[model samples]
Target chain A: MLEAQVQFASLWKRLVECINGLVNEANFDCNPGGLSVQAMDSSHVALVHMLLRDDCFVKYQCGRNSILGLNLASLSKVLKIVDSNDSLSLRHDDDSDVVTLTSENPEKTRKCEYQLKLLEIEAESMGIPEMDYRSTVTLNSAEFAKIVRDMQVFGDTVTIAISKEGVKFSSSGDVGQGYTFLQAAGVEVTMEEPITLSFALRFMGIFAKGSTLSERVTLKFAKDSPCMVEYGIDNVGYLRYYLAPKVD
Target chain B: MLEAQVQFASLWKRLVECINGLVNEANFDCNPGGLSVQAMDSSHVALVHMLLRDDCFVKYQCGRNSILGLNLASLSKVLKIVDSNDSLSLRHDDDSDVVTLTSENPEKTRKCEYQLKLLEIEAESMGIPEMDYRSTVTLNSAEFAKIVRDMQVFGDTVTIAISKEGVKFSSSGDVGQGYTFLQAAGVEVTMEEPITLSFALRFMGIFAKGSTLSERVTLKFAKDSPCMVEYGIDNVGYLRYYLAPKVD
Candidate 1:
């Protein structure tokens, strides 16, 4: 029997929402450590990595290791049935091969069950590639979302320049120039040399759409390499996005 | 001085979320009863109303009656900063004449202050007109959301048929027929005669969007009158949406 419980429904709600914004179907690997999922978009221009540690769950139990293929959108729809504050439990029935979600409140208890359908998912066998990323910084998710929105108003590409001093996000197009810059204090900056890269505005916009799930977001980047962005509420579950840089 | 504190951030978070979907701007009237807001949508197609009683607050203090006008979107942006588990305090700053939001977390106290500009909003002295709604039913928000989504596949207009038997939702165009019928105990089917109403797909979409924030949603309909929907999640506050029906 496999069962897991979480107190806040929005945490799971937001994570699934973020995942849906990028990819349609995904394979979730469940193990002793917790639930983890990683998938690259069809175009390979972007990748999404998510990890929900064991500590994140109010109650965690698993008989053995298993991989569950899920339609992210469907799971999200199922989650909508459970209340945010209600105690939520996810369990898999071995006999029927079905996943059940139960939410309990004072007056009533609701249960929604779905069959665990087989899915053909080609998830990367290896973990996310480790890189000696040159820069790492934390910026407010709302600020980042606003910057991406402003940039998309002007152009389809954004130039990200990161240095020890600060980070600058700028975009230019026929309309006008749009840029948002933040220093180390207001924004946490950790880097030595300046590293500049460009990314498609559409890609950034999709990732920024998940900013509502968290407050402060951390960005890891390297010169001429993909950038990884991570955001979570209360350091619980995280919505991690990876986007390949565009050579401009 | 007006101050209200809550231990659960999601209470206010969910409230603001539902409000933002229904109303663009609103005037919050605070008195001994509690924080209350009532307003109609810009197009006058819908009426958004909310009320939070004194017992709902962990701490409540109000000396004088006051009405504060706030942009629902702006207040939602501010609420995003508070941790759902952290204690939150909302108070009026006499000096700046703005509302201050502060969250108490172990790491750091995140606070965001917004200028509460006063706007003279004349509450419609005329109360929401009562119509002899033809149909009344209570359905799970998740199930209702699915029906709404399925109807979208057919066209942008949904034809709702109400009868003494039950409620029927159907939509059809050049594509095909999309229909969903729901029946549950105590659904309160009170339609005297069969009534069919056409409603915009997009308007119903937003109405169902926040339904997940509550448990079971109550939907009432009339031939040419506005629809009334209500749902509440325990500590998260209540959502009451009034949507005008379209005439065919």
Candidate 2:
């Protein structure tokens, strides 16, 4: 059994938006420590991992570990009626396959209740080992979103080059080519060694939706390995997405 | 040759949005007096009439009467890139089959030019006769839009009742029924006799898009006749839509 409460419904809305673009359905593992989700996109090309500590919720109680599989689209649709300032409560029992959501206005004048049936999604959790990256860049989340969005207009892939000078993103398509460069002055960058890699713009575009969750985004890249895009959710936890580099 | 210019590109953007929802393609009749468009929805259930006097444009020139047929969607796509403060200029030559649109930023640092081929659309202008309606109601444009939008969730048709007390809008569907009422204090109402009518909610919803063009909307209802919904453009002209009352 598990129950959680949040002061504002917008937190859950933003969290779902950050994950829905990659996977349509996912299983949430909830325990005494926290709640986490790890799922791969349908094509098995990109993976998304999310964590939210118990402290992030105003009230959280988990009598036992619970695995809840939910369809992201259905969840989003139910959350659409919630106001930004509305209080939201979630409840589920170990014996039931239905999860209940309740939202109440600040003045308690309006209340809405929704019930969603749980799905039987088979998923496994894997341990992600930390590794040192060749280059890491932390920049304004909005700026990163805009860059990825603009690069998508040019091509299917965007080449990211990080050096002592700065970071440059470039793409070319049948229409034309575009280049966007950012200096270290505007971003916090650490370069053990300059690195250049290309990634699918489609995944980057989806990952950029996390900009609404945080003000800054961190990107870690390695040679011919999966790149990590992370956004810190205030003082609670973090949402991370990993995508494999495109091969020539 | 015909040429017209507006200080703010947003004016044209708003104007196009108001019409595009009713008709996909329309012919703009440009003359020395003004620019006017009269088009019926594909189903011929609703008619939209728009007029923008020459005084609305910062500069207007017409060597002769010109009928420029255009796809509203394409025109809207080209105008999407324009900033609110950008200056817009339209030019078309009598012998050419294409129209040119130019948009420039206020600082003159950015400019975009697009050429769209004129479509051959067969249309004719019709004179709408004036008739004294039983009741006239002037209400906030936003309020009107909200009522029509909310009514859509309940049913495909909305019933409007106007009396000396005020105006009422109601709709019912499989989901449920909803009623929205406005008193004479909140709206300006002139009622010679009470009138009750039903209209297609889909068309009403599309007509409500004109809320962005004006602050107030005037609704004139006649017993068993088409109702007129009008929005006046500031110091320029008006956009009007007439929808025949639904019959049992």
Taking the candidates in order, what DockQ does each have? 0.03, 0.04
lDDT, candidate 2, B129-184, per-residue tens: 45778789999998889777766655899999888878888776643445666667
Candidate 1 residue-wise lDDT, A126-183, digit = tens: 4576777768999888889889888898899999988777889998889999888888
Per-residue lDDT for A34 in model 2? 83
How large is the interface RMSD of candidate 1?
8.4
The reply for model 1, stretches above 4 Å from the true place, is A95-97, A106-118, B1-248
Local distance difference test, each candidate: 0.73, 0.86
Candidate 1, B1-248: lDDT as tens digits:
78988777778887887778766678888887788888776677777777787778889898788778777788788777667887777788554557767677645555434444455566554256678876787877877787788667557888777776577777755433445554433355666677877788877887786665766788888767888877765654566777777875
What CAPRI-style quality would you assign to candidate 2? incorrect
As a TM-score, model 2 comes out at 0.55
How far residue A17's Cα lies from its native spot in candidate 1, in Å, is 0.4
